Amino acid sequence: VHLTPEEKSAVTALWGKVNVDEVGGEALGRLLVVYPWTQRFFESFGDLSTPDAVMGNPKVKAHGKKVLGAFSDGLAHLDNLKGTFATLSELHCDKLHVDPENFRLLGNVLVCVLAHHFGKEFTPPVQAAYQKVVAGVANALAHKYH
Amino acid sequence: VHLTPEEKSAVTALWGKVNVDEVGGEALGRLLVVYPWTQRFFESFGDLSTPDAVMGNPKVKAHGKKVLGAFSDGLAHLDNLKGTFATLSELHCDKLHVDPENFRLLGNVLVCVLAHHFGKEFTPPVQAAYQKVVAGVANALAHKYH
Amino acid sequence: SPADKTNVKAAWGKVGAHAGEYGAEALERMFLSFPTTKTYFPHFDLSHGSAQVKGHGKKVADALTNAVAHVDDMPNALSALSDLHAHKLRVDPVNFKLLSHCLLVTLAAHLPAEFTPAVHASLDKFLASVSTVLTSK
Amino acid sequence: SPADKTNVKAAWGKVGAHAGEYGAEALERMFLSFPTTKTYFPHFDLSHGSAQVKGHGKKVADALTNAVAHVDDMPNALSALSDLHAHKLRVDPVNFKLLSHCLLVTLAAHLPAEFTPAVHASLDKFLASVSTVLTSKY
Numbered sequence: 040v041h042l043t044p045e046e047k048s049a050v051t052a053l054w055g056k057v058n059v060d061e062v063g064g065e066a067l068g069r070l071l072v073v074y075p076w077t078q079r080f081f082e083s084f085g086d087l088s089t090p091d092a093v094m095g096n097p098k099v100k101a102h103g104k105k106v107l108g109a110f111s112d113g114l115a116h117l118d119n120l121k122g123t124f125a126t127l128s129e130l131h132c133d134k135l136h137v138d139p140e141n142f143r144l145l146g147n148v149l150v151c152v153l154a155h156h157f158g159k160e161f162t163p164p165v166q167a168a169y170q171k172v173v174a175g176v177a178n179a180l181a182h183k184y185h
Numbered sequence: 186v187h188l189t190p191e192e193k194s195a196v197t198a199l200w201g202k203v204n205v206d207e208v209g210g211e212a213l214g215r216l217l218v219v220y221p222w223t224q225r226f227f228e229s230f231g232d233l234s235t236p237d238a239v240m241g242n243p244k245v246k247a248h249g250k251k252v253l254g255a256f257s258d259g260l261a262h263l264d265n266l267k268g269t270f271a272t273l274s275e276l277h278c279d280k281l282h283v284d285p286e287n288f289r290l291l292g293n294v295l296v297c298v299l300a301h302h303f304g305k306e307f308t309p310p311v312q313a314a315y316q317k318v319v320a321g322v323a324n325a326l327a328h329k330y331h
Numbered sequence: 332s333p334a335d336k337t338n339v340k341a342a343w344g345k346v347g348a349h350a351g352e353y354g355a356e357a358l359e360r361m362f363l364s365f366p367t368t369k370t371y372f373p374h375f376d377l378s379h380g381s382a383q384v385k386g387h388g389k390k391v392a393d394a395l396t397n398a399v400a401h402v403d404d405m406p407n408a409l410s411a412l413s414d415l416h417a418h419k420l421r422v423d424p425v426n427f428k429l430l431s432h433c434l435l436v437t438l439a440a441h442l443p444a445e446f447t448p449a450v451h452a453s454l455d456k457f458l459a460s461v462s463t464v465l466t467s468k
Numbered sequence: 469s470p471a472d473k474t475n476v477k478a479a480w481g482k483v484g485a486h487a488g489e490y491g492a493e494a495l496e497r498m499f500l501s502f503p504t505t506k507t508y509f510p511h512f513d514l515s516h517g518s519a520q521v522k523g524h525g526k527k528v529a530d531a532l533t534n535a536v537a538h539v540d541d542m543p544n545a546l547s548a549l550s551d552l553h554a555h556k557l558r559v560d561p562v563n564f565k566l567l568s569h570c571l572l573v574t575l576a577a578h579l580p581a582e583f584t585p586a587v588h589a590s591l592d593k594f595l596a597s598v599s600t601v602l603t604s605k606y
């Protein structure tokens with residue numbers, strides 16, 4: 040994924056203020072609420088029957104933290120997303136068989152969550168840079184389909 | 186795109202029987218009928234107001250031929266689709282502004298046309314091999330958009 | 332459109348006694364072309380001759396004949412299938428596009444005289460309308 | 469659902485006089501994130517302060533308030549917009565998903581207290597319905 044130097048430091052600057060313990064669970068939780076078929080993949084996580092149950096579920100939160108961590112690895116290695124996400128692509132594609140359209144949905148939910156938290160500071164140019172990043176992650180996760 | 190040897194020679198065998206000329210215009214014509222927003226990209230082609238006008242339009246035919254010629258280049262270079270389609274990816278994005286979802290639609294229309302022509306001979310394993318190819322082509326055409 | 336309803340009824344009505352054969356072919360096409368779709372059938376025999384895939388193909392094809400007969404009234408007629416596919420099975424809406432494509436490919440291969448550009452358009456719209464209903468909850 | 473209609477009317481009703489500002493922001497977000505969309509606007513000044521984008525944003529946002537007021541009745545209420553977007557402009561349906569996403573991003577940034585998970589779900593469904601109507605001659 041090809042970012043301008045401008046875009047690069049706007050992304051890294053904003054991400055430094057992200058609560059690594061929270062935003063992942065907020066993003067994952069919203070995926071499961073907004074796009075309820077995604078719950079199929081998380082049956083062992085227990086109670087997901089209502090929005091409040093999803094957001095307050097400690098496994099969504101704990102798994103959310105891992106998902107966000109992989110996004111951070113991505114941000115540290117934008118010239119090598121395919122390599123960075125290679126074993127996770129195996130997992131999500133060969134083992135879990137998650138349809139890749141769902142990778143594009145999570146990426147966009149994460150963008151809505153960043154907007155929710157940063158308000159005015161999540162400017163349109165900043166969004167445009169994060170859209171390139173999350174598309175790059177989704178495409179790297181899908182590498183084993185194609 | 187990774188095909189088995191079996192898959193490779195089934196694809197090559199079936200493509201040898203393809204009328205280079207005629208299938209391209211049928212595929213392109215069906216795109217414009219089934220997904221009518223695609224006509225926006227072809228206003229200079231003249232009469233597109235009915236299915237019969239689309240299929241019998243000599244510019245649809247002539248442009249169909251070019252599209253299908255690029256597909257044949259693809260089949261000759263399956264280990265290098267991104268490279269093979271690099272200039273065309275540029276053209277479709279920077280010059281024509283075609284949304285990449287439309288690449289996936291054409292590919293599937295082409296699959297329907299092959300099935301229409303070959304009937305029983307377009308077996309499910311043969312379809313599966315062609316679906317890998319048209320996905321690979323659509324992905325390669327979308328490569329310079331990011 | 333009214334012409335869409337005419338084209339679907341004419342084309343589908345010429346499936347007749349092949350309904351089960353075509354549904355089973357369409358499923359097989361889907362499972363081979365898009366292998367992620369196999370996880371929804373973890374307890375099926377999905378090998379090429381399967382009695383289970385043929386039986387299931389017949390049900391799918393017969394639900395489509397019922398959707399043809401109730402074109403104007405599909406949310407009500409397919410109510411129990413929407414329950415099943417959206418509330419119980421949780422099928423990703425991508426998969427409906429995938430099966431719809433494999434149904435059109437199957438009809439193109441078996442009914443070439445019927446699969447004109449206009450009929451293809453109509454069938455494609457019809458299968459998308461059936462898919463929204465089935466995923467609508 | 470009935471709860472979807474409640475959530476949309478509550479969240480959107482808080483847009484109030486900011487309608488234009490948010491519609492314009494959403495368009496700007498779309499143009500920067502998804503630059504293929506810019507071809508639909510051949511002579512527009514699409515820079516950040518643009519009077520033209522602000523005027524257009526207000527029309528978009530006001531059509532959404534009208535859709536909110538006619539939720540049960542949208543095919544009839546948005547009839548002329550479907551004519552425009554599907555027959556005349558021939559807007560690719562992908563682009564409605566793109567603008568819908570940018571409208572949700574805009575609301576999340578301005579109305580954080582309102583943009584709960586449930587409200588987000590409802591808004592996403594409402595915008596998809598509006599998009600079906602606008603692209604429905606297809």
Ligand code: HEM
Nearest residue numbers: 077080081105106109110127137141142145146176177180
């Ligand atoms: C798009 C970006 C995504 C990233 C960066 C991501 C990252 C990860 C990571 C880091 C793990 C755990 C690695 C490990 O500890 O072994 C994982 C597991 C998983 N992911 Fe994702 N993921 C993404 C999308 C998705 C989506 C969209 C789904 C949709 C249903 C999904 C479902 C899962 C499941 C079910 C697991 C298994 C966890 C377990 O068994 O504990 N993931 N993912």
Ligand code: HEM
Nearest residue numbers: 223226227251252255256273281283287288291292323326
């Ligand atoms: C997916 C496979 C496709 C292939 C292989 C393909 C290939 C081509 C080729 C070879 C050309 C002419 C290149 C030249 O001589 O410079 C071309 C032009 C064009 N393509 Fe495609 N294309 C595809 C899909 C699409 C789609 C889906 C659209 C629109 C919805 C599209 C719109 C066009 C347009 C508008 C032109 C220029 C036509 C003109 O001269 O007015 N293409 N494409």
Ligand code: HEM
Nearest residue numbers: 368371372390391394395412416420422426427430461462
């Ligand atoms: C036009 C599209 C479709 C039609 C008409 C259709 C029809 C049906 C019917 C009639 C049944 C069983 C009836 C019953 O038990 O009450 C069923 C079950 C099922 N369908 Fe579909 N279906 C469609 C699409 C899909 C798709 C795309 C999937 C993708 C994975 C799918 C997966 C299933 C599954 C797993 C079952 C449960 C069957 C079992 O366990 O025996 N269907 N469908």
Ligand code: HEM
Nearest residue numbers: 505508509527528531532549553557559563564567598599
């Ligand atoms: C929620 C979705 C949308 C709404 C509510 C909406 C609403 C409107 C309205 C109210 C107008 C002006 C009607 C008039 O006074 O003539 C209009 C025009 C237009 N819309 Fe949209 N629209 C939407 C989506 C889109 C998308 C996705 C695109 C393109 C990517 C688009 C492109 C246009 C264009 C080009 C015009 C013509 C403007 C001009 O040159 O004056 N619209 N739309």
